[model samples]
Target: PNEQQLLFEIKLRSQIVQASVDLAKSRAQFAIFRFSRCNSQFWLRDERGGFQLRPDVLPSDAINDIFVNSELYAFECATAIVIVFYKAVLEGIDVSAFNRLFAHLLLYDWHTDKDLGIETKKGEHFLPGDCLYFKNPDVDPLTPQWQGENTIYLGDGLFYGHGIGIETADSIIAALNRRRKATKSAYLLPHITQMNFAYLSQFARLE
Candidate 1:
């Protein structure tokens, strides 16, 4: 059933895809560093710019705020991926379970995030909500942040790469190309990263 949730285009689409598309088209800004950043009242910013869930906060509430009040947030692309995954989870389950499922929360990259369950699969065919990559193998040393972009496919030839905005593949590559070593170019990777929907859906009551 969870596989069907991801594979079928339930006019409802996958809620994850719907949630992600809502974000991609939102007014939220993107930044590599947290500057004048705002997050849910339940989330407190760490010195390193990561949002840590307060002990008293309901995890579901904090995650929901990212979408309900998008203008109040901005963060790295990686962290954005984490939030989107959580948002999808919230849409499919009861708030109490979601809060329990993510009792401890840290809004950061998947590398350090404890519960994101990001699953990567090699494929050229993209789908909405799939975290895609664009590699700049020879990035400018001074700005290593451009080394790669973690974009979310939003279907219809569009993708949302934080800081680059919503654009087609060629445009995203062009943006990266300008920031790369003069002799090197940025290219899209065939790998797509997605949350472990099969496992995550176990806690939800999917429609």
Candidate 2:
């Protein structure tokens, strides 16, 4: 536990953590996600509403809408975590540069159309904004959605899981357990997903 801080300073890290907190408190819903309902004005919605960035639109605008028009968006937990990363970065970088960096933004989970520079490390302790996972080893075959959950650790044992809402580890596992196969259960994974903050800070606008 003697490791130093994860970043040079706390500004960006706090921004990221705050982004996660804000989303958890928002009205965004959870769903398997289909794009036929997304606003065509700024996004090219495709399979599962995977928002491919439109060349004419500022990437920040669309990401902002995911919060501004919260009710209109629904996502799987992983996709939600991705949005939190973008929102986090936007808070600390030059808007114009941020827009260009994500000019080819890909909103669909694990679908690579652009690089986000995700970093993962052995997670022994969690802090705010850490994107975490919960696995249901024997989820009901009929409901593949329950097999795993992507979440944001909000500290104090509270986690933000898209379909499950904000809950403690016990409650989150219980929620997952309710959907499990006969004898299986759910549990937290020690893996943590984060952005490469040092690399990203190169783009941050300074005072």
Candidate 3:
């Protein structure tokens, strides 16, 4: 791409990110919802930390039926929010590519998943709209696996954690590190394009 085209694409993607963050902020003040294996109700919050219930935002009942038997977790919430943002801002974008399982791969198996996003190196700067992952090295005794979480950076030192709600970047990091099991905490830069669902990519200069 030419310099001008690249710059335009970058600006456009940044705008999309800002819009996504705003959408998240609009729904960020809600109470925590526990992960469920078969929950149909979508919980949300207003700006005042009040509880609200939303029906599925899927495009159709058939789309909703796809996840009927699957469990809903933090990753699903994050993915739904992103898909909603794309559907609103990016015209002609294919939303089907970001189905529930695709979101799971982006969040839980990001390190090994090449199609979703790219892992950041140590000390890489995080930009708005980047996906952040946190993992507790100390495994849950019962599960014997790392306790993991995902959040979206909303810039201005704030992040929207799907299950935990919105909080400052420092606070989120502190809370994750408090358990002394935080093995890795890094951001993933998404590859934004109009034709496909956003995927993470290696660090690229935006400014």
lDDT of each: 0.76, 0.75, 0.41
Candidate 1 local lDDT, 44-159, one digit each (tens):
87788888898997888888788778898888888877777778777776677788879988887876766757778889877777888899998988888899898877778988
Candidate 3 structure lDDT: 0.41
Across 122-191, the per-residue lDDT of candidate 3 in tens digits comes to 4446556556665555544454222545566666777666545567856665655544433555323233
Q: How far off is residue 83 in model 3, in Å?
A: 2.9
Candidate 2 minimal-lDDT segment of 10 residues: 1-10
Q: Using lDDT as the measure, what is the rank order of every candidate, best first?
A: 1, 2, 3
C-alpha RMSD of each candidate structure in angstroms? 2.8, 3.0, 10.2
Which residue pairs in model 1 clash with each other? Answer: 10-13
Q: After TM-score superposition, what is the CA distance of residue 60 in candidate 3 from its true location, in Å?
A: 9.8
Off by over 4 Å in 3: 3-5, 15-19, 22-85, 88-123, 142-146, 177-207
Query: What is the total number of backbone clashes in candidate 2?
Result: 1
Which regions in candidate 1 have their CA more than 4 angstroms from the true location? 1-13, 34-36
Question: In terms of TM-score, which candidate is strongest?
Answer: 2
Model 1 TM-score, 2 decimals: 0.85
What is the lDDT, from 0 to 100, of the residue 73 in candidate 2?
70
